[PDB]
Amino acid sequence: VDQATLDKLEAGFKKLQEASDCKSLLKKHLTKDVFDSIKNKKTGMGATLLDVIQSGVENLDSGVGIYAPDAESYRTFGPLFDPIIDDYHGGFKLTDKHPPKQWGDINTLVGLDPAGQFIISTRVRCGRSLQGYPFNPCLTAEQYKEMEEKVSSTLSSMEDELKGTYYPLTGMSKATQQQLIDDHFLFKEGDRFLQTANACRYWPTGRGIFHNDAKTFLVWVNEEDHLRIISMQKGGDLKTVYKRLVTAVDNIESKLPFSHDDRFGFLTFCPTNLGTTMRASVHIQLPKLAKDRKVLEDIASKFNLQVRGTRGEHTESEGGVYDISNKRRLGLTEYQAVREMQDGILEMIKMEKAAA
Ligand SMILES: Nc1ncnc2c1ncn2[C@@H]1O[C@H](COP(=O)(O)OP(=O)(O)O)[C@@H](O)[C@H]1O
Ligand SMILES: CC(=N)NCCC[C@H](N)C(=O)O
Ligand SMILES: [Mg+2]
């Protein structure tokens, strides 16, 4: 680790201590001891502690603040990752290992809001990394193109409900892109947390979206993760949404090799996405409970749920519509993760009906 990198780290650590109102897990868990123990370490691809913490140093409003530039980073910088992962995912010890993939009994899932007065739409996503490719900050432009080719070629073999078309971001009209983002289908462009993590280099090369005509099945290529595999539709039919995701992931898994770790389950760029990589969410209105987004968040947290704005994380609610989802992804099965959202949303709706 060169001297220029060390200077920036010491200055970054200092900045974090002085940021009296910073509430990120990075600040909370980067103790002087932790800091000194790993700041001189480097991975085989040259990822340093700076590459890990830089996004959180520059964006003090980060909730977490770190990313893994490569798989090795998760262990090379373990003393920082380990406590943060344990913290975020609601308990995960050094000796713990993520359980084997288990979708569970899909037939046990229910409709989340039969009368249709609270839930707007339901969505479940997963993420995957291609074996042989590092995470965003270590990728070259050429690698983005190689991966885009591989993934798009694989998805051309999808059939029936899952059959669809790949749309590259390169050459995509501003109008077409903007509508897809507005309609909650395409990942947004230019995220400051990802940018400062050097996750958006060479944009928009290699980036794009696959989807069926109904746009109930989508795959993001080369945004935050190599793949995000998405099932979504209007209404509260979680069972169908989850079933479609399972079918899609099972099919893609037979064709493309994805990175899996004995301890961390499926590997992802952010530690929040490890394990099941699963975020099951609803867009929901709860006017009585949501009379203060912090009261809503406090209610949600007891159900292990996270609250986001209408256009995704780091955004506000619009027209009272919130994104509410399972927070935890690692140290529980796919089934357990989706059930936490279902169970939490069902009770919150009950609470809403009862609220004065
Ligand atoms: N239940 C949902 N129904 C409709 N759109 C959703 C739902 N949950 C998330 N989205 C959309 O997904 C997109 C990505 O948002 P983010 O908060 O970045 O989620 P992810 O885990 O998908 O990266 C945003 O446009 C957000 O509106
Ligand atoms: C997309 C994603 N990984 N969100 C979780 C953390 C995001 C951001 N780096 C933060 O620390 O708030
Ligand atoms: Mg995102």
Curated annotation (Swiss-Prot):
Consequence of changing E224A: Reduces catalytic activity by 99.9%
Effect in UniProt of substituting C270 to A/D/N/S: Decreases affinity for phosphoarginine and ADP and reduces catalytic activity by 99%
All residue ranges annotated as the Phosphagen kinase C-terminal domain in the record: 118-355
Cellular component terms (Gene Ontology): cytoplasm; extracellular space
Residues the record lists as binding ATP: 121-125, 184, 228, 279-283, 308-313
Effect of R311G: Reduces catalytic activity by 20%
Location of the Phosphagen kinase N-terminal domain: 8-90
Family as reported in the entry's similarity comment: Belongs to the ATP:guanido phosphotransferase family.
Subunit structure: Monomer.
The protein, known as: Arginine kinase
Lineage: Eukaryota, Metazoa, Ecdysozoa, Arthropoda, Chelicerata
